[PDB]
Amino acid sequence: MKGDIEHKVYQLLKDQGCEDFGTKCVIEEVKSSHKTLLNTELHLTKYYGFSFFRHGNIVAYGKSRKVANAKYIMKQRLLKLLEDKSNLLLYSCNCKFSKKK
Ligand SMILES: [Zn+2]
Numbered sequence: 360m361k362g363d364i365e366h367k368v369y370q371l372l373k374d375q376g377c378e379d380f381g382t383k384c385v386i387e388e389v390k391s392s393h394k395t396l397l398n399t400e401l402h403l404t405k406y407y408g409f410s411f412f413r414h415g416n417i418v419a420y421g422k423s424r425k426v427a428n429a430k431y432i433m434k435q436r437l438l439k440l441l442e443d444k445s446n447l448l449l450y451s452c453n454c455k456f457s458k459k460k
Contacts, residue, residue: 360441364419364434367441368411368448376455380413382433387422409433411448418448 360367365382372380388405407429411419418440421432440448451458 364437368437383410383412
């Protein structure tokens with residue numbers, strides 16, 4: 360496929376009978392500051408903790424100072440999973456019914 364990992368994730372997962380998934384974007388600031396001279400560190404060295412959630416689990420993780428790089432990492436995570444067919448993102452679940460081995 361090409362490009363947008365989110366669409367790929369949706370394309371198959373929603374078709375597997377899943378709707379419970381999505382990306383989370385929380386900032387993980389690296390506090391190298393012991394004390395400071397203002398209320399809070401106006402702007403310290405923070406990192407965008409991009410991650411992909413699937414049933415409360417972490418399928419993709421990519422923390423970077425650059426939003427693009429952060430996204431890039433997590434994207435290539437699930438990207439490899441749908442390419443390699445690793446069940447970490449693509450496993451069957453009960454958003455519809457039971458499963459069969
Ligand atoms: Zn599900």
